[PDB]
Amino acid sequence: KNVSIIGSPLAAGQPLGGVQLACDDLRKLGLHNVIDVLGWKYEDIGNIDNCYYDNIRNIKEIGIFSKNLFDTMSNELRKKNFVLNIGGDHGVAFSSILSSLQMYQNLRVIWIDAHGDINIPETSPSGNYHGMTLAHTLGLFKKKVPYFEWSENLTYLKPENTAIIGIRDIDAYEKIILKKCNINYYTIFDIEKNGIYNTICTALEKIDPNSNCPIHISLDIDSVDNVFAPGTGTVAKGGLNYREINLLMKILAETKRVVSMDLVEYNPSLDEVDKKVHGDSLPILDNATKTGKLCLELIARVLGYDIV
Amino acid sequence: KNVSIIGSPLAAGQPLGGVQLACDDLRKLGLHNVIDVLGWKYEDIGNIDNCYYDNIRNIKEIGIFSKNLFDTMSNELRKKNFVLNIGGDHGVAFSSILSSLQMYQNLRVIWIDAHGDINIPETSPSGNYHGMTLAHTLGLFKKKVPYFEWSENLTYLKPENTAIIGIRDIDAYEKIILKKCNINYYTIFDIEKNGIYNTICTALEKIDPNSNCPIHISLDIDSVDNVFAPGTGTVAKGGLNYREINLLMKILAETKRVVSMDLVEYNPSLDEVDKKVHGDSLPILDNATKTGKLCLELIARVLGYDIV
Amino acid sequence: KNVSIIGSPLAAGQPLGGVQLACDDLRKLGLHNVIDVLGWKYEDIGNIDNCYYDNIRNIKEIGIFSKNLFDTMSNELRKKNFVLNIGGDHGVAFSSILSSLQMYQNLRVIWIDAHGDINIPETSPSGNYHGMTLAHTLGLFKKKVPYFEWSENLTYLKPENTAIIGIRDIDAYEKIILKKCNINYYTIFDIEKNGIYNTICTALEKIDPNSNCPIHISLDIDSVDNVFAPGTGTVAKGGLNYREINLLMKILAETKRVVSMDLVEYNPSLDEVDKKVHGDSLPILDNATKTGKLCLELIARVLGYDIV
Ligand SMILES: C[C@](N)(CCCCB(O)O)C(=O)O
Ligand SMILES: C[C@](N)(CCCCB(O)O)C(=O)O
Ligand SMILES: C[C@](N)(CCCCB(O)O)C(=O)O
Ligand SMILES: [Mn+2]
Ligand SMILES: [Mn+2]
Ligand SMILES: [Mn+2]
Ligand SMILES: [Mn+2]
Ligand SMILES: [Mn+2]
Ligand SMILES: [Mn+2]
């Protein structure tokens, strides 16, 4: 029960600043106290400091940041600690997943997101890297990426070993890429049809039929409906509700196989208050903004926090 | 893949004006662009212009309008186009359903509504025709209706060939009429028990056991909860949520048997903004009012719009 | 079809006043008219007037009030009327359940609440009695309670004959007490997994396998999410939604075995307006605050109010 905390305040994968503030905000709201009360020990590593495609915005900053995160996380993973990577925008998942994958070759990835993040640079409508991160991680890029030379000999994630859950806002080209690469995906309609519980069980059975693989959770908070998670940059209607996202994290915790996790796209500057109700019982700052509080609660779930 | 668009701005079935503005509002919000992007071709026909019961309000206007709609829609139906009838209050469904039924004798009707609209004039607490339209269409009226002589020799809809879905606000007398006429109905409690997916599958199996009948969808937007669809005149708590109504329309689209549809009771004057989030990706006007945007999205669903 | 109405305006089980106003507020909103329209007859009894543990706040007032409620309710129960006990905070459930249990020895209790209310005085973080009421009723208290001598020879409720439904905010010690006493409990996660319908059927099957026992419903309105029930003192995120709580009450009504019920923790001073929509059809005051209106609707459900 040891967790390494890595702050990855990268904001270069998308237009806005805001997400660079997420790591320190969650600490301020009570990350350490929450981990403590759940009976885990932590080591907080602090924050990461900071022929070719030519159409990815801010790629130099992203590439240089990613090398640093990769090296730092590799070192934490070797301790056999659970590693919690707090973004930052979703661009931080590249180094997170690949570092975990080099150590855990049979890693299975659960990517929880309103979006596919599976554009390649030639299909992206925005040129924003956080909308391409999963495609990059899956080895789908067709040319070299500036400032990513350090990554060129790594083993990439396989689509059949990945499940994307919660998606509802996919670009025209992404729809094609999604079907073509044969990744396992579960849309909000699948969830409405079958329920979140059946959905995650189906996904886990599909990617880990023998229930014996390490799991990495990459959680984009915009998977959650805006009613509960307004503090995020790219909102899509009809998201996971409060009960659903909490249950999803609980079920993943109960596998006992989660080895690493990203929590990304939390933007405190866009967050709002309820605020404080009696049910906010975790040692989280009274009256905290609701998305930040939800992030801490979902981290608690992964660490075993349960109702009874 | 051809759709005829008919604007039916009838507001005489209920107290308020507002719904007469719906047709042009949806055009302004991007109806044509939405249809175009989905790979359909449209023909926009424009807007319909405008011993006995003596207790139906505004019946002259309704009767005269209905003759015009019946004649106009009959002509579009003969083209074998999908026909989209945009109200207007629900009173427009009489001519819509009966014109479609004369052409498609084995038509099956899915009536999606918070209400039964199945009062007869002698049981109506309001005298408002939009609360009687389904009863009229089902041949339940017991006396002649002024200005409906043109309709007296038509074949009427049969209750066993109809399913009402989403109901939750039914008048005392309506409850009796509903049970008596043996229509198939699925309340919000049935939906809460079984889920929207099982519910529509059950309904379709009940009215079209051989999966071989043309389908008409009569969608009253007040079936949807006020949180998502405030722009409507008669609100009932506990409606379909955003995910549910989208899934329902998707499942109906996937039958490949929908031949005509009403979208009624949208009142732009009562609508509100979110507004614009990234997920609003259809070519719908940025920052559109939320009910209008939802209407366009649900039309998109019927035309095949899907997440992946 | 006779109901005795007892107002139990006890506010001493928790810090705030407010709940003492609930009984008269529901009468003002139309309790009598609602009962009348459902074809029931009522008798409104009015309002109840008003070695040892030394750490229960306000226990003298609570103990003296409880003797009065016990005596008053015992008398109503003997009439073989359905007895409706309107709080007041949840402290009123002690005398309510025990009086009903002395008469109906095979009583089964369905406790609907965001909370367990199953602290004992030595584990309570607050010293507030309304957070201990279920533990007291279950005979879990280990010392005598001041001003409860009148209750010392009563038969107490058994955990195996009880089901708690909707829970989500449980204290650390409560979690242990809950597991230890072997009460049947169904958390909001169980409800999210299986749905409210399967959940209540499972609970009823567990505590009343032969479907032949009288049922007492103890409904704390804070079981319902704040979106629908803001008028309550102790809010917990992720509660039952409007559709769920209505369906739950309907299913319990349909057993035909409910003999008594508490409706507690409604605090009009914390309530808010929508307000009035067409769907508010019960004879409830136009524009009533939403929690009060919901309380009346849920009482209607127990008395047989249904959609069709
Ligand atoms: C338009 C879009 N698909 C948006 C991606 C959103 C990134 B995320 O998961 O927060 C793109 O820029 O590629
Ligand atoms: C009271 C009422 N049942 C209301 C009908 C609502 C019409 B609708 O579906 O928008 C009536 O006037 O008959
Ligand atoms: C902290 C708490 N568990 C709160 C109990 C809430 C009572 B209720 O069901 O409304 C306690 O005071 O024991
Ligand atoms: Mn993402
Ligand atoms: Mn996203
Ligand atoms: Mn209608
Ligand atoms: Mn309606
Ligand atoms: Mn309680
Ligand atoms: Mn409670």
mmCIF file of C-alpha atoms in Angstrom, chain C residues 19 22 26 85-90 111-115 117 130 165-166 168 217-236 238-242 245-246 248-249 261-268 270-271 289-299:
data_model
loop_
_atom_site.group_PDB
_atom_site.id
_atom_site.type_symbol
_atom_site.label_atom_id
_atom_site.label_comp_id
_atom_site.label_asym_id
_atom_site.label_seq_id
_atom_site.Cartn_x
_atom_site.Cartn_y
_atom_site.Cartn_z
ATOM 1 C CA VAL C 19 -38.103 19.995 11.014
ATOM 2 C CA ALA C 22 -42.745 19.912 8.692
ATOM 3 C CA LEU C 26 -47.483 19.311 4.743
ATOM 4 C CA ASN C 85 -46.086 9.487 11.388
ATOM 5 C CA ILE C 86 -44.745 12.801 10.047
ATOM 6 C CA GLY C 87 -41.575 14.114 11.733
ATOM 7 C CA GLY C 88 -39.677 15.807 13.021
ATOM 8 C CA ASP C 89 -36.153 14.420 12.742
ATOM 9 C CA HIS C 90 -35.513 10.677 12.545
ATOM 10 C CA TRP C 111 -35.374 2.102 6.412
ATOM 11 C CA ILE C 112 -34.766 4.461 3.480
ATOM 12 C CA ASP C 113 -31.944 6.875 4.172
ATOM 13 C CA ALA C 114 -28.643 8.274 2.921
ATOM 14 C CA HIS C 115 -27.336 7.400 6.392
ATOM 15 C CA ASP C 117 -28.398 6.163 11.816
ATOM 16 C CA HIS C 130 -31.080 11.125 15.069
ATOM 17 C CA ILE C 165 -31.858 1.144 1.439
ATOM 18 C CA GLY C 166 -30.093 4.087 -0.246
ATOM 19 C CA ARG C 168 -24.010 6.361 1.031
ATOM 20 C CA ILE C 217 -41.537 2.197 6.033
ATOM 21 C CA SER C 218 -39.214 4.676 7.703
ATOM 22 C CA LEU C 219 -38.461 7.266 5.054
ATOM 23 C CA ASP C 220 -35.781 9.890 5.648
ATOM 24 C CA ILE C 221 -36.205 12.344 2.773
ATOM 25 C CA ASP C 222 -32.417 12.883 2.605
ATOM 26 C CA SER C 223 -32.263 9.490 0.871
ATOM 27 C CA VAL C 224 -33.343 11.516 -2.164
ATOM 28 C CA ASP C 225 -30.786 13.557 -4.077
ATOM 29 C CA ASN C 226 -30.532 17.278 -3.206
ATOM 30 C CA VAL C 227 -31.591 18.196 -6.743
ATOM 31 C CA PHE C 228 -35.100 17.002 -5.863
ATOM 32 C CA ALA C 229 -35.060 17.262 -2.076
ATOM 33 C CA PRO C 230 -33.049 20.270 -0.941
ATOM 34 C CA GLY C 231 -35.312 20.793 2.090
ATOM 35 C CA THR C 232 -33.393 18.630 4.539
ATOM 36 C CA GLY C 233 -30.615 19.091 7.082
ATOM 37 C CA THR C 234 -27.972 16.531 6.214
ATOM 38 C CA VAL C 235 -27.322 16.231 2.495
ATOM 39 C CA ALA C 236 -25.255 13.482 0.835
ATOM 40 C CA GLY C 238 -25.537 10.904 -5.261
ATOM 41 C CA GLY C 239 -28.985 10.175 -3.831
ATOM 42 C CA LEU C 240 -32.094 8.480 -5.204
ATOM 43 C CA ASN C 241 -33.526 10.398 -8.140
ATOM 44 C CA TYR C 242 -37.158 11.481 -8.577
ATOM 45 C CA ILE C 245 -37.943 7.214 -5.037
ATOM 46 C CA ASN C 246 -41.412 7.334 -6.606
ATOM 47 C CA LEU C 248 -39.695 2.524 -4.645
ATOM 48 C CA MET C 249 -42.782 3.816 -2.820
ATOM 49 C CA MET C 261 -44.778 4.764 7.970
ATOM 50 C CA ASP C 262 -42.504 7.601 9.100
ATOM 51 C CA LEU C 263 -41.719 10.519 6.852
ATOM 52 C CA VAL C 264 -38.872 12.392 8.537
ATOM 53 C CA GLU C 265 -36.217 15.119 8.157
ATOM 54 C CA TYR C 266 -38.253 17.385 5.900
ATOM 55 C CA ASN C 267 -37.173 20.955 6.800
ATOM 56 C CA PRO C 268 -39.366 23.547 5.060
ATOM 57 C CA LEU C 270 -34.331 24.824 3.748
ATOM 58 C CA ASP C 271 -36.704 24.024 0.864
ATOM 59 C CA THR C 289 -41.680 24.198 -2.250
ATOM 60 C CA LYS C 290 -40.338 21.154 -4.078
ATOM 61 C CA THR C 291 -39.387 18.912 -1.150
ATOM 62 C CA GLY C 292 -42.753 19.420 0.511
ATOM 63 C CA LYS C 293 -44.521 18.626 -2.735
ATOM 64 C CA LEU C 294 -42.365 15.529 -3.162
ATOM 65 C CA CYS C 295 -43.230 14.388 0.369
ATOM 66 C CA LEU C 296 -46.937 14.622 -0.446
ATOM 67 C CA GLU C 297 -46.417 12.764 -3.701
ATOM 68 C CA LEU C 298 -44.556 9.943 -1.943
ATOM 69 C CA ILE C 299 -47.311 9.670 0.643
#
